[PDB]
Every structure is written in structure tokens, then in C-alpha cells.
A paper describes a structure:
[name] is a non-canonical ATP-dependent histone chaperone and a major cancer target. From a structural standpoint, [name] exhibits a conserved multidomain architecture comprising an N-terminal acidic domain, two [name]+ ATPase domains, a bromodomain, C-terminal domain, and an exceptionally long C-terminal linker (CTL) that bridges the bromo- and C-terminal domain. Unlike most other histone chaperones that do not require ATP for activity, [name] stands out due to the presence of an ATP-dependent [name]+ ATPase domain. The [name]+ domain adopts a conserved structural fold found in the [name]+ ATPase superfamily, with each monomer consisting of a large α/β nucleotide binding domain (NBD) and a small α -helical bundle domain (HBD).
However, when a specific mutation (E532Q) which specifically blocks ATP-hydrolysis was introduced into the Walker B motif, [name] formed stable hexamers with homogeneous particle distributions. In the hexameric structure of [name], the six subunits were arranged in a right-handed spiral with a rise of ~2 Å and a rotation of ~60 ° around the helical axis. This resulted in a “seam” between the top (herein referred to as “subunit P1”) and bottom (herein referred to as “subunit P6”) subunits with an offset of ~12 Å. Five binding pockets of AAA1 were occupied by ATP, while the binding pocket of P6 at the spiral seam (P1/P6 interface) was occupied by ADP. When comparing individual [name] subunits we also discovered a conserved N-terminal linker domain (aa406-423, referred to as “LD” hereafter). This structural element was only visible in the ADP-bound subunit, P6, and was sandwiched between the two subunits at the spiral seam (subunits P1 and P6). In the [name] structure, a salt bridge is formed between D415 of the N-terminal LD in P6 and R540 of pore loop 2 in P1, potentially stabilizing the P6 N-terminal LD-P1 interaction and hexamerization of [name]. Third, while translocating [name]+ ATPases usually have 5 to 6 subunits engaged with the substrate in the active state, only 3 [name] subunits (P2-4) engaged with substrate, suggesting a “weak grip”. Second, we observe the N-terminal LD of the P6 subunit wedged between the seam subunits, where it effectively glues the P1 and P6 subunits in place, thus limiting subunit translocation and symmetry breaking. Third, only three [name] pore loops maintain a weak grip on a short length of substrate in the central substrate, hinting at a non-productive or weakly-productive state if [name] were to pull on substrates. Together, these lines of evidence imply that the N-terminal LD acts as a brake that maintains [name] in an autoinhibited state thus preventing premature ATPase activation.
Residue numbers in the entry:
A (entry chain C): 421 to 727, 786 to 945, 1330 to 1390
B (entry chain D): 419 to 728, 786 to 945, 1330 to 1389
The structure:
Amino acid sequence: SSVRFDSVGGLSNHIAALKEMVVFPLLYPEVFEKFKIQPPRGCLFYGPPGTGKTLVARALANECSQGDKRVAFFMRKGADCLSKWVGESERQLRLLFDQAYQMRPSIIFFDQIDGLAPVRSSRQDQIHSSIVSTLLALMDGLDSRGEIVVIGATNRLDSIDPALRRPGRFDREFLFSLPDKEARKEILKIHTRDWNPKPLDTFLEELAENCVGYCGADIKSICAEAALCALRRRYPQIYTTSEKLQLDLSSINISAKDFEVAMQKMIPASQRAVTSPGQALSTVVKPLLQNTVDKILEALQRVFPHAYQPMSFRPRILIVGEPGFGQGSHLAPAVIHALEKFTVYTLDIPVLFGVSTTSPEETCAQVIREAKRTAPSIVYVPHIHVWWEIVGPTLKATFTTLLQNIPSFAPVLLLATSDKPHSALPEEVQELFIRDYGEIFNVQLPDKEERTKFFEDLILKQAAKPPHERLKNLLKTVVKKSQNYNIFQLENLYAVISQCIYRHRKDHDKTSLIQKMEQEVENFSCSR
Amino acid sequence: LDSSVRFDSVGGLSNHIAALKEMVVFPLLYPEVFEKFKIQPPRGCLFYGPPGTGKTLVARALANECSQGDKRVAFFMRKGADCLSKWVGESERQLRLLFDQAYQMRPSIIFFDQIDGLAPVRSSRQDQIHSSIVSTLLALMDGLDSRGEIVVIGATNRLDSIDPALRRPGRFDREFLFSLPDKEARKEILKIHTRDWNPKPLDTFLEELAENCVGYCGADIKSICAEAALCALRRRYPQIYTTSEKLQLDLSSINISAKDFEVAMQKMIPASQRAVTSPGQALSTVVKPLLQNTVDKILEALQRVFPHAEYQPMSFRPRILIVGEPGFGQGSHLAPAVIHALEKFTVYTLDIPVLFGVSTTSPEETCAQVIREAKRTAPSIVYVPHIHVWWEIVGPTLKATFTTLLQNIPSFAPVLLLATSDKPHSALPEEVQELFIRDYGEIFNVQLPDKEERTKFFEDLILKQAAKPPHERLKNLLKTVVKKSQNYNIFQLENLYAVISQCIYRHRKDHDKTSLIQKMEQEVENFSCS
Ligand SMILES: Nc1ncnc2c1ncn2[C@@H]1O[C@H](COP(=O)(O)OP(=O)(O)OP(=O)(O)O)[C@@H](O)[C@H]1O
Ligand SMILES: Nc1ncnc2c1ncn2[C@@H]1O[C@H](COP(=O)(O)OP(=O)(O)OP(=O)(O)O)[C@@H](O)[C@H]1O
């Protein structure tokens, strides 16, 4: 009862839209007399789980409860109005709507309406069709319900009777989506506000950009796993006894390493049932391909200028390379990760076919509807030289005519990759990418500069640790030998050279494992 | 209850009020015409249609037109099913009371709002209470012991989920369709909801509005007015949302203009296309000066073959096939614009993402459903875009269904078949070639726009926007663009347009030009497409 639009970070247009349905007709009643208005009194929250849909209703209740113009608040769970006797289910609804009419102004909040108002079908019990009919007949009927603001919250929007969604019943619909890098930082400032050792802004700014895919609840949860980790690290004897000890509340300060352990043990809620098709370069491969990622992002910026309003025409790009250059394995997911705040919808083999009781066409038809709705979006088809060889002609005819229906100036990017050059691709694909327009990117192998930094830290610093003139020669030899390896062979040779280092952890003296490195780099053969 | 609604705001529905005052008003006013022939006029209706169209508004107007009048017809109003009761025989008994109380105060009206929640179709799998309350509702509407002078009315959104024994001449002998308004009917709802305003809006402005509100239904038209007023209030006082306090605002600088009716229609989705998109869209503001004339020519050809696009106009198997080269924008820009121009005709689509896009339904079952629906509600369109591909994507069972179902249609039924193709007519298969009879006028050939069309396309962008503060060589650039882009199709044209708009965007904040004009010049010079 102490949350008042203060803890709600990242959602500011929704709150502004919400104080003109509830607050303004009470504060400025003479503006709505000039035009005879009666502003909208129906909204519908929807989105993925954890994204601030119940926090906003809580804050609005507390905002209107404490003030001059006291408003009521009636709260309902999913389907708690159901009774077993044949006339009582829809008598409790009539009772609730009439009780709210003598308290007005009031607010009726329906939490999780997915279980109250399904689409009326004959293949179910009458109890649901009767409840929906009375609900819609009571909301907007012959009686002018009055100053009652009805709100509902849901995850599954399209499973609600389409007669409830029209001006007069549920006028406005509100999308609560995952936070971007700038709202994650607001949420982090909120949840780490009354802390003894107030964290710096430059630290929260680095945290907000590492917690990609998080949503509200996940940030609030790491802000607590960090404290539990600090506690466990400071007092290891608190898990081997069954009584209260003298906990010194002064040496329990939270450090960055605790946040690191918290973020290492935790998976966000969004990618728990699925996996995201976008992943940053590992810390090993990062000093090898970030320059290529930057070049691809510049090409995108040329074709997809959403990365006066920017105007883009059929945003499309095709990343081509040789098999092994890592364009569908390291590069395109890193570009997808760099372009977060744009929702991604993959169409690849283990997604069309790796799920049954749904056709490939029914998934290809929905991943484009949802991409048109939430534009600017991305539609990801990797390895099209095989994707186009593992699909039927019905799926080709559906796909190639579903992106011909997208508006001419639709901010929807089609990103794809291939191993065979653009000329070796079949027809009907060479006409989707028009490199006269800059819709083709040709990857090339990393330069010497990058290849040296790929190996330096391994062969120089971690080479001779705790528990120096020949190592330069070894590094030069390694970089000279591998001037034509692709990426797979490069990182293979990286693990082979790191193996010897591991078997000599307990050796206090070097010069015995240097021969190991010499012979391992010598007897390492590839292909190419 | 509001006592001010009395057939004054119910714009658009005049053929229903006229049929509704000869069931209630006339047997009281002229009770000698009905005992000349001894006819006993119809005393049953059934309102139905899409959500938000004037079904309940007409009942709210009838209640007032009869209560506050000479004669005293009584009104009984029931919501979905509020006759149900907890104890055993009490659900049915209540109904009888409602019909007896109505018999003692006759003449009277009973109005069942959302009657599809009271009287479903009787099925042996559901509760016995519903199957036994339908059989007692339809035993006291028309059984022995004549009803009397009660007028029963029922309003619903699902018509075919009502027991078919109720839809009968003697229980519900008149079904009324409340469909989406057309243009002339939207420019009456608009004059009703802005009836008592300040500086009353011009009829020319209300016509400009009624043209752009396609897909709106009564409630959306009433809602855009509120949204426009709110947008104006926000535009005038931006500091009225950052105080949570009462302030002093002069109720005179808050006049509603245009550009607030225009921003309201951005964040507004009609109720009809909120879960499914219609296959008809008008030309965007960019492409319009490039293809409106082609749309008009197509509509003239339609006028020839489909006379119902102005005795009576008589037609015979109205068909047309819009052919053009690939890229000429006939199945992507033109056919939906022709569909959108022909509103007030119902439009069904038969294309791949719709046949092979929904499961648990045969592909040759939807094809049999849409043709039946189109027959039922003629004049109607059946839209098959890209038949040069549609024909090589369906099986022979679906072909034998489709070609023999468009023959079962009566000859003079105004059901139009609209299709497009990229292959010329000669390159199509025979079984399709023989469905269009060019010597009959059933083929239209598209051609590239002319110099005039291209000049008007590029003019306002190269001339009146390149200056745009945050004149003799701009016209030379315009001439060069209109020259070099003379063998392009529409995709390449509207691609060059976006390529030139990306420069102007990049050079927003530069107060001085001549860094934008040479940029423009090199961009147009470097553009290569074919
Ligand atoms: N913008 C935010 N600022 C602070 N905390 C947030 C924010 N968004 C979400 N949270 C945290 O997430 C919790 C859930 O909010 P809410 O439950 O309304 O989301 P939801 O969409 O209802 O989730 P679900 O759909 O699973 O019910 C809150 O208790 C809050 O701690
Ligand atoms: N012809 C009209 N003239 C003026 N207003 C109209 C008209 N038609 C509809 N409306 C608006 O629509 C609102 C009511 O909708 P309606 O009376 O059609 O019930 P309904 O919403 O159709 O029932 P359901 O919920 O099944 O759709 C009214 O408030 C009215 O402002």
C-alpha cells in the first residue's frame, strides 16, 4: 500500500493514457461538458509474463484511494464469480456491477480474464456462453452503466470474445512488452533505491546492458540473489548449524562479483520454455569477429535505417560466406542480439518441424502476422540453401506470397544466411535479394591483427601464471601457421593449446609444458 | 435510462424503423385495416449483425417513442438469462410469470438482449435445464391459448446458434440485419455525434471524414470524437499531466481542429478488423498520384461488366481478370484498392495463406463455405489473387470443387469473381483461359504510368520538402529524375522515392542546403536497378 506510480519504471505513456480515463473526468468535469464527451472507460492490458501489468493496477488503486476525489476499487481474480447452482453464477456478476454503481466513481479490475471470457463456442458448456452474454449485456446494454471503469489483464489476447473488444466495452488495448536498455536501468534504480551503500549510476548502466531478455521480475530477483550470494560468501559457517549466530551486519556489502555469480546462475523467464535465436559472441571469439559484426551493422544501417521519420523500403539482407566462416553460427545471432528492442521471429527447420499438432504453414502464417503487428521486427531464416531444400511447394507458395502482402513501407527486416554464393542459389531466391540495392554481404576471414589478439592472452599471460622470451616466438609461429584456417579450425587449435595449460596447473615451474605447446602446434593438421 | 433518444440519432437505419412501426404503432392507430382482411400483423423480430451497429440503440429509442407518447405500450427488458433460478421448477416458472405480467398490461413489448445466451440449439450433450427452458419458451410464444398483443424482440450477435424452431412465422417471423454503415450512413452518425458542438463542423469536413472511416461501426465513429477532443486538450495544455493538481484552463483555446482528427485515427483500430485484416486497402498517400487513374479505368471496365456499380441493372456472371507484367502492381496495389472502392459489397478471399493457413479445416471446405456465403449475401465479391500460382498450388479435388461451384451460382446473380495474374492471358493453362472471355470485356491490361503521373509523384518531395526550413536547380534535378525513371515498374519507382527520402531525413538539422542537393544528385546518379 505504498506503491504510487513511483515503482512503475519504463511505462509512462500508459500511465498518461490512464490518468485521462480515471483522473481527469473528476478533476476537470467542465471540459467534457463542452463537447459532450464521456471519455473512454475501458482498457485491456496484455503482454508477456512479468512485465508490469499487475504493478500498474496496484499503483492506480493506491493513487485514487488516497486523494480528494475518493474512488472505489473492486478486484476479481480469474473466474471467482462461478457458483454451482444454475442461476447464481451470473447473479454474482449482476450483484457486483450494481454494488459498483452505488459506489461510483469506482473501478472493476478483472485479473486474468482468459478464464472468464473465452470465445463463445458450442463445443463447450453453456455456463461460459451464458456468462459472456450477461457480461457484454451488462457492460454496454440499455441502461448506461455510468462512471464505472472496467479493466482486464491477460496474456492471451486472441482468446477473448471479439464482441468484448469494441468501443463501449473495452475501448483501448495496452501492450506491456519487455524492457529495453533504457527502461531496465530505471527498474534497477527503483529496486536498489533504499540501499545503505548506494550503487553508482555507471554500474547500473553496465548492468542494464548485460541483462538482455530480462523483464521486471527478473531484475528484482537478481537484486536479491546478489545479496544472498554475498551472505553465503561472507559467512560459510551459517549453513552447517541449526541456531542463530552473531551475524555482523557491517561486512555484508555487495560487490560486482556477487552480481556476476547471480547472473551466472539465473535464466530469464522469457527463455525458459524456448531459446532465443540471438546470442552475443563469447568472450573467446569476441576479439575475432566484432569488426565483422560492426561492418554488417553498417550495411544494415544503409538498408534498414531504423537502426520526420526514417523511411525504409523492404528491408532485406543476405549474409553469404564460405562454409566455415561462421555467418549462421557466430555472426547473424550476434547481429540479432545487437538489434534488441526489435522482436525476432525465427523460421528455421527445428521450429517448423520440431513441433507437432501444427502445420509448417500454420506457423509460417502466424510468425508474419505477429511480425507485422509489432513492427519494426525481424524475420530470421538461417541457412536458406538448405531451408529451401527441406520445404514443400505449398510452404514456398505461402511464404513468398506472405511477404508480398506486407505494406511497401513496412519496417520488417528479412535476415537470412547462406553457404553457397548468391550465384549458386536456386532461382526464386536470387530475386529476393537485389545486391544492386546493397542486400548482400560477403564475409571474409579475420586479419592478422585480429588473429594475434585472439591468441595473445592465451600464449602470454595465462601461459605463465602463479601456482618470457620464447613465448613471443611461439605466438609468432602460431599466428604464422594459421593464416588460412577458418573459424572452426581456429577455435579448435585454441582449445588444443589450452589443454596443455590445464594439465600443468599444479606445476610451480614452467619450461616443461612449453615443449607441450611446441609439439601440439607442430602436430596440428587441418584441411582447407 | 436516457429519455432523449427517440429516432433522432439512429442514423443509417431507416428501412428498419419503418418496418418496426407497422408492428407496434399501426395496429393501435388504424385498427380497422387489420380487421378488414383479419390479418393480425407480425409480432416478432430478431436483430442481428456485427458488434456495434444500432441493435440496442433502436430498442432504447423504441422504449422512449412508446412510453412518452399518446398510447401506453409497456416495456419489459431482459438481459441474457436472468430467468434462471436455483430451485428445481423455478427457472421455467419465472418465464411464465413474465408472460403473464405482460398479458395483464397489454399492449406491451418484451426485449431479450443477447438471446443466444438464453435459447441455444437443443443438444443432448448439455444440461437438461437449457433443453427444457427452450421447449417452454417456444410453447408460450405459439402454442394453444393464443398469446395476445405482446411484441417479442430478441437481439443477438450469433444468429445460427439459436434454436431453428424459434425462427418461424409465429414466433420470430422477421429477421433484421444490422450491417456496417456505408459512406452516406456514416455521414449521418457523424452529424449526430457532433450535433451540439461549438463552431459546428462543415458538411464538407464531415464528408472528408466519412470517406476515411472505412470499417467503422457506429461506436467507432462515436469514439473518434472523444479521442479527438482529448488529443486537442493534450496539445493545448501539455503541463496538465505533470502536476496531479487542479489548474485554471481557459475553455476557449481548446477548439477541435483537423490534425487532431488525424492523429486520433492513427491510434485507432476499428472493432471489425481488430482480429482479422480485410483484403482491401486504399492506396497510400505516396502511391496515390501514381495509380489512382489506373484504378479509375479498372472501375470503368467494371461498370461495363458489373453494372451494379453506379428497370434494374441486369448482369450475367460478372468476371474480370487484371493482367500485367510482374512488378506493375496489380495484385499488390490495384486489386485491393478496387476492393476498397467497392465497399457495401461483401468481400471473400480465396488465397493460399487462407486456404493452407488454418488447420482442423479442409482446404476444399473453406472454398465451399465462402461460395455459399457469397451466394447468400449477394451482391458480393470472391477474390482470387494470383491465379497463375493459385492453380499450381491446389489439388485436383479443390479444382473440381471450385470450377463446379461457381457454376451452381444462378446466372443473373450479382456475384463478381475478381482475379489477377502476372503471366499474360495466353500463357495461362486452358482450364483457366476459358473462364475469361476477352471479347466479353473480362480482361484488363495494366500499363506503366506516364510522365504526368511520375512528375506528380516526385514533385512535392523534390520541390516542397527539400527546402523545409528546420530553387532553380531543384527543378533540373526533378526533370532528370522524371526522365531517367521512365522504364521502371512501381517497385523501382517507390524504391527510388525512399532512397531520396533517406537523404532529406539525414539532412534535417542543417539550416543551409547545398550539402543535401549534391548528396541528392550523386544518389540519383548512382541509382541502378535494371
Ligand atoms: N516497470 C517495473 N518496475 C518495477 N518492477 C516491475 C516492473 N515491471 C514488473 N515489475 C516486477 O514484476 C512484478 C509483476 O508485475 P505484474 O504481475 O503486473 O506483471 P504481469 O504482466 O501481471 O505478469 P503476469 O502476466 O505473469 O501476471 C511486480 O511485482 C514487480 O516487482
Ligand atoms: N446508427 C447509429 N447512430 C448513432 N449511434 C450509433 C448507431 N449505431 C450504433 N451506434 C452507437 O453504438 C452504441 C451501441 O451499440 P449497439 O447499440 O449496436 O449494441 P451492440 O454493441 O451492437 O451489441 P453487441 O455488443 O453484440 O455488439 C451506441 O452507444 C451508439 O452510440
